[PDB]
Enzyme design. Sequence first.
Site, PDB file in Angstrom:
ATOM      1  N   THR A   1      14.290 -20.933  75.293  1.00  0.00           N
ATOM      2  CA  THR A   1      12.432 -20.442  75.507  1.00  0.00           C
ATOM      3  C   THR A   1      11.988 -19.456  75.643  1.00  0.00           C
ATOM      4  O   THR A   1      12.486 -18.309  75.449  1.00  0.00           O
ATOM      5  CB  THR A   1      12.042 -20.816  77.134  1.00  0.00           C
ATOM      6  N   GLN A   2      10.647 -18.840  74.737  1.00  0.00           N
ATOM      7  CA  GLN A   2       9.821 -17.726  74.599  1.00  0.00           C
ATOM      8  C   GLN A   2       8.775 -17.811  75.572  1.00  0.00           C
ATOM      9  O   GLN A   2       8.275 -18.497  76.007  1.00  0.00           O
ATOM     10  CB  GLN A   2      10.286 -17.646  73.111  1.00  0.00           C
TER      11      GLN A   2
ATOM     12  N   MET B   1      14.541 -26.078  73.146  1.00  0.00           N
ATOM     13  CA  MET B   1      14.084 -25.340  74.276  1.00  0.00           C
ATOM     14  C   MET B   1      14.065 -24.468  73.474  1.00  0.00           C
ATOM     15  O   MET B   1      14.259 -23.610  74.082  1.00  0.00           O
ATOM     16  CB  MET B   1      15.301 -25.674  75.251  1.00  0.00           C
TER      17      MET B   1
END
Lengths: 233, 233
Positions: B1-2, B107
């Site tokens: 996730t970013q 993700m």
Amino acid sequence: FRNNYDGDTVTFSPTGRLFQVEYALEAIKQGSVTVGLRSNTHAVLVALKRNADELSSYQKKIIKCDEHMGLSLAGLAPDARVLSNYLRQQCNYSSLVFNRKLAVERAGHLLCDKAQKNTQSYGGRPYGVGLLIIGYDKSGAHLLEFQPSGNVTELYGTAIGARSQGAKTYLERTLDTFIKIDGNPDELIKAGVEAISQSLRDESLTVDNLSIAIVGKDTPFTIYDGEAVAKYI
Amino acid sequence: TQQPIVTGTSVISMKYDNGVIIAADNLGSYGSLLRFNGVERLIPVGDNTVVGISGDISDMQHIERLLKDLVTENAYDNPLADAEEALEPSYIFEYLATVMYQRRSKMNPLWNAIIVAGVQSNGDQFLRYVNLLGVTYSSPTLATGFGAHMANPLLRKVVDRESDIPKTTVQVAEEAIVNAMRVLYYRDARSSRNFSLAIIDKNTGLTFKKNLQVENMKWDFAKDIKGYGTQKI
């Protein structure tokens, strides 16, 4: 000599030979004959199924790899299953990831590479089976000959197995003829059965003994066995 | 996730009778800072495909590299790399769609919205979208981000359904797109006046236009607007 250099595939003989590979090739020669040939619209596979007893079945020699590709085997059946399965996955990968049908020439490259690994590393053994791959892709009809050495060649036609040399000389003669059998499958097959009968000796191709497979322009690789091949005997 | 850092706004496109058009401004924003102005967000692949990318620019650069590798790889042991076995727009899209969905499934997405525009080998127009979630869809017109809200309504007044495609010319189509780019410059606070536009016609091929500018803007009426209600001067 030989005896000291053929204990495994990781050993070169003094003349640069790889006996284990050569012995593997010998398994193909011992295998029942199968023929492959193509025109510009179709590719055909004709294979002589061998039986153990007269109470036994005539082992299948043709495996479909995808709607547009398939092959015929001569030698260790299990190895053919392993190799065709690998080919099925590669065809599948191409479709799922790129929505692209695998090029017959690409399949040949993949098989060559998979077999090569089993000839340079300790512990493994070469594949003991020969394969004839036919397919119809974005460049037309195709016929490939696969050898356990990892050598794959594209041809107009050929044959592998026992007495295969018969059918081979015949096709190398009939070349100019069959290569033009476009738009007519029945003819191409008949020519295929004529090449194969050139390798008979023991018996004559019967109904539960003949196996034919075809692929082309508007024909998804399909296999004909038994009654379905009756009209060709 | 970013979280996206440097970003590109809208990518708008549509198909006309002989091909597809796709455009995108040359801005690389950093939050509310309009930081970079020489950013090309339209990626040509071969001469039948253009990939327009919005979202995170570092990920776009990554996708760019992926695309160049596809071309390099496809050429390997491929004597028909510039013919029957050249990259089709549909192969390029299926590939990216696969990567986008795999990345969101781990993700760790590629924070982008992508439109693949091109012409298939049989002449068919190709226009499909894929984003960071792996979601995909096709429509006569396609736009990302702000363009989805303001460009689609305009472009759809030209091609409202499939049957309107054969009735739409490159002139009409390019005009719509150029008008839409101007509208986006009026209401999108993260847009730029400079943009690139590409046309992929089944006859004229790929035409890539750089350094275009929004022109013919109406601002004069601004002099007449004073105050926010009761003020007279």
